[PDB]
Structure formats: structure tokens, C-alpha cells
């Protein structure tokens, strides 16, 4: 297998539309009821549409009646929301999730940002291990809008030990953030390191080799 | 529509210990037909989606492990997990399924209290790459340490630094419990290059004394 997979997130202009899929596999899709709910970032689960097994039955959050529209193609094995006149108070993480008894094999979800701000690549710079058993090294991504970026270290061969930040909104209005990682000092003098950067928003990949 | 209300907000229990969140509706979720009280339970762990744990106020899905219970009647309903391990660590919410819409408690953070672990300090001295842009990023880096109670102050030439640095903390870690933390001085080309002593000196509950990492520029 059961697979939810919810992707047409993107930075969006207030009044806006955006229409969001939500693609289902492993399962018989058009016996189950499907439903989004969405997630302010740092915030709680908040539900926001239903619909039954073919869509003759619809429902909404207060928040969002009136402007969003909620549909299925059984065929297709997805599920859609349709958001028009986007605010502010719009801007989550959207997941879908199929029913039953309550709401399971909620998918990753999509990132729905709501702002006029302009899109902005990051610069990535190193944090380089000093010669002064563990060694601890990273890489800065500074200054970009909107979220998200995604860190990988050496391709996604290197996981352990490794610790990305929490993005945080600087003085400017760009987000920056640094992941780090500690790896044994007895590798430094052979063993490469390269933080792999994706900030999708603005096509910008950066791979960047942090050395001693 | 139907009010659902969680307490307490946050939480912190020991490990091995017991975990008790309640969740109160503003009405009655019980479908007399079916015989069931239509609640649900979900865990949401760091950077992860929601797991449904419980569904119709006491039946678990199946893979949760037994240390996860639902309870209750009515207007009031209780998640209890006992024998408390480290991938506990979440916010925990309650979900009404009896009529749309299908609202959510505001959710509980669960903190997971581990014995005290002193943070591994670590300096970063801003790039030659960054400098040539005209900025300075100066890193300093707390690792794996638990509280999450920390002081972090920057010191240039010895004068204490203000207004100028920020912090971000991760999630607490599903395995050690521990937190970790930076925090980013940030100052102009010119600025930095009138001083040479750049510290970071860390105060936690950890270590003996407040530590201290630096570099000459």
C-alpha cells in the first residue's frame, strides 16, 4: 504494498490556484474513502476534505469550503484537491490518507507555499573539520525562499551521525540552515565528503566536497 | 462541529516509564449501531507522516506494539503507553470519525526524559568561498546532548556578542533521545576581519564547567 503518494505542491501567488494529486497503489482504491488533511509547518493535523468510494459524497473544513474541490478518477487509482484563492493560512504540508476505521498509509506529503516572495536559490559553503576520536564537518545553505531543501551526504552513503537543522527564517526574510555530520578523525585523511544540496524550487543541485 | 481537547500540551516521562494523554470531545462519538466509540489515535514522529495507532477508542492496527492502549467513553477518551522506549518520542493526536468534519485533537508532545548527556562542542570558521561574497558565517555546533537546556554565547576578541547570531535545534533523536544545536553567528567581511579571537562557549548541565571552542581568523 500500500502506497500514498501526494505530489503539485509548489510556491503559489495569494488568490491563486493549485491542484494537488494524491496517486494510490497496492491496493483497491475505489473501496475505500480518501481523505487530505493538512499540516502548518511547526503546527498540528488539521482535516481538511473527504470523499466516499466514488465521489458522491463530499465534505470540507470550515477554512476551506467554498474554495477547494475534492475528486477522484477510480480508473486513474487517484485521488485530487483543487484549491482556488489561496491565502496565507493555506500555506502546509497537504497528505492523503484512505479510510476504514480511521485514517491510514498517510504519504509523505506535498509542501503548499502561499506568497508573493520571489524564488531564491541557495548558496551552499562548507564547514570544514579543524587539524584541532570524532571529527565533526558540514555544509551551510544559506539564503533561499521557499522551502524545502534536502541534504543527502555522499549520495545517501553516509546517514549515520548526521544531523540537518531545522531551516530558520533570517533577518532578510531568506531561509538558512546547515547540516552537520561526525565521522572517526581516522578517516579524514582518505575518505571524501560531499553534501548533496536539491533546492527544487529554484532548479538549483549543489554537490559541494568539504575538506580539511 | 466537534471539539477535540488534548492534555496536557506537552509531556516529558522517563523512559520505561508510563505515558497517560487524555483527549475530551464536545459531544457524544459513540455510534450505537456497531456498538463502537468512533475515536482514533495517531503518532507522528520527527519528520515523519502520522501512524495510526488505535481506531474505535481501544482497537490497535495491527504492527503497533501492545504498549500502546486506547481507553474510554463517551466525552472522554485516554492513550496510555506504558514501558516508555526512546522511538516513543512524538506528538500524539486524537481523531473523532463519527461525523465531518473529521477533526483532530490540537495534539500532546511526548519528550522522552533521558539521563544527562554532555554536548560534544564544535567551531566552524566561516568559508574563504562565503567571505569572498562578503558575509561570515561563523558555526558553532552542540552535539547529541540532552537536556535541551543550553547556553550558547559568542565571543570576539572576548566582547559578548548580541543581536547578531541565531539558533535552530533538531528533534529529539528516536534512538540516543538526545537534541543537538547550532547556532550562527553572522557578521560583515569588514566587520569580521577587525578581530581575530572567534569563540563559542557552551554552559549545560553536562559538563563541569561552561566549555569553550575557538580559532584565530
Known amino acids: 504494498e500500500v502506497q500514498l503518494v501526494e505530489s503539485g505542491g509548489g510556491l503559489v501567488q495569494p488568490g491563486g490556484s493549485l491542484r494537488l494529486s494524491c496517486s494510490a497503489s497496492?491496493?483497491?482504491?475505489?473501496?475505500?474513502?480518501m481523505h487530505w488533511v493538512r499540516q502548518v509547518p511547526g503546527k498540528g493535523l488539521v482535516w481538511i476534505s473527504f470523499?466516499?468510494?466514488?465521489?458522491?459524497?463530499?465534505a470540507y473544513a470550515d477554512s476551506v469550503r467554498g474554495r477547494f474541490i475534492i475528486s477522484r478518477d477510480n480508473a486513474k487509482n487517484t485521488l485530487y484537491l483543487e484549491m482556488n484563492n489561496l491565502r496565507g493560512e493555506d500555506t502546509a504540508v497537504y497528505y492523503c490518507?484512505?479510510?476504514?476505521?480511521?485514517?491510514?498509509?498517510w504519504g509523505q506529503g506535498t509542501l503548499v507555499t502561499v506568497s508573493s516572495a520571489s524564488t531564491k536559490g541557495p548558496s551552499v559553503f562548507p564547514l570544514a573539520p579543524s587539524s584541532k576520536g570524532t571529527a565533526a564537518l558540514g555544509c551551510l545553505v544559506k539564503d533561499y525562499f521557499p522551502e524545502p531543501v534536502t541534504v543527502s551526504w555522499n549520495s545517501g552513503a553516509l546517514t549515520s551521525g548526521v544531523h540537518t537543522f531545522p531551516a530558520v527564517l533570517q533577518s532578510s526574510g531568506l531561509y538558512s540552515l546547515s547540516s552537520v555530520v561526525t565521522v572517526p578523525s581516522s578517516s579524514l585523511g582518505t575518505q571524501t565528503y560531499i553534501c548533496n544540496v536539491n533546492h527544487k524550487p529554484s532548479n538549483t543541485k549543489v554537490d559541494k566536497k568539504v575538506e580539511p | 462541529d466537534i471539539q477535540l481537547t488534548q492534555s496536557p500540551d506537552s509531556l516529558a516521562v522517563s523512559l520505561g516509564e508510563r505515558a497517560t494523554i487524555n483527549c475530551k470531545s464536545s459531544?457524544?462519538?459513540?455510534?450505537?449501531?456497531?456498538?463502537?466509540?468512533?475515536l482514533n489515535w495517531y503518532q507522528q514522529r520527527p519528520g515523519q507522516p502520522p501512524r495510526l495507532l488505535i481506531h474505535?477508542?481501544?482497537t490497535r492496527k495491527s504492527g503497533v506494539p501492545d504498549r500502546f492502549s486506547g481507553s474510554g467513553f463517551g466525552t472522554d477518551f485516554t492513550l496510555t503507553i506504558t514501558s516508555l522506549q526512546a522511538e516513543d518520542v512524538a506528538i500524539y493526536y486524537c481523531?473523532?470519525?463519527?461525523?465531518?468534519?473529521?477533526?483532530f485533537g490540537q495534539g500532546t508532545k511526548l519528550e522522552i526524559k533521558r539521563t544527562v548527556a554532555a554536548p560534544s562542542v564544535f567551531i566552524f570558521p566561516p568559508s574563504d568561498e562565503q567571505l569572498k561574497s562578503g558575509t561570515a558565517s561563523v558555526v558553532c555546533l552542540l552535539n547529541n546532548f540532552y537536556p535541551r537546556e543550553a547556553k550558547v554565547q559568542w565571543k570576539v576578541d572576548n566582547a559578548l556578542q548580541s543581536g547578531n547570531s541565531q539558533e535552530s535545534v533538531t528533534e529529539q533523536d528516536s534512538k540516543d533521545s538526545t537534541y543537538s544545536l547550532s547556532s550562527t553567528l553572522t557578521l560583515s567581511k569588514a566587520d569580521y576581519e577587525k578581530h581575530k579571537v572567534y569563540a563559542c562557549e557552551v554552559t549545560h548541565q553536562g559538563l563541569s564547567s561552561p566549555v569553550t571552542k575557538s580559532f584565530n581568523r
Open positions: 490518507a484512505r479510510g476504514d476505521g480511521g485514517l491510514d498509509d
Open positions: 497496492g491496493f483497491s482504491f475505489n473501496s475505500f474513502w
Open positions: 470523499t466516499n468510494n466514488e465521489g458522491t459524497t463530499t
Open positions: 459531544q457524544s462519538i459513540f455510534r450505537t449501531s456497531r456498538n463502537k466509540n468512533l
Open positions: 474505535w477508542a481501544s
Open positions: 481523531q473523532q470519525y463519527f461525523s465531518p468534519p473529521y477533526t
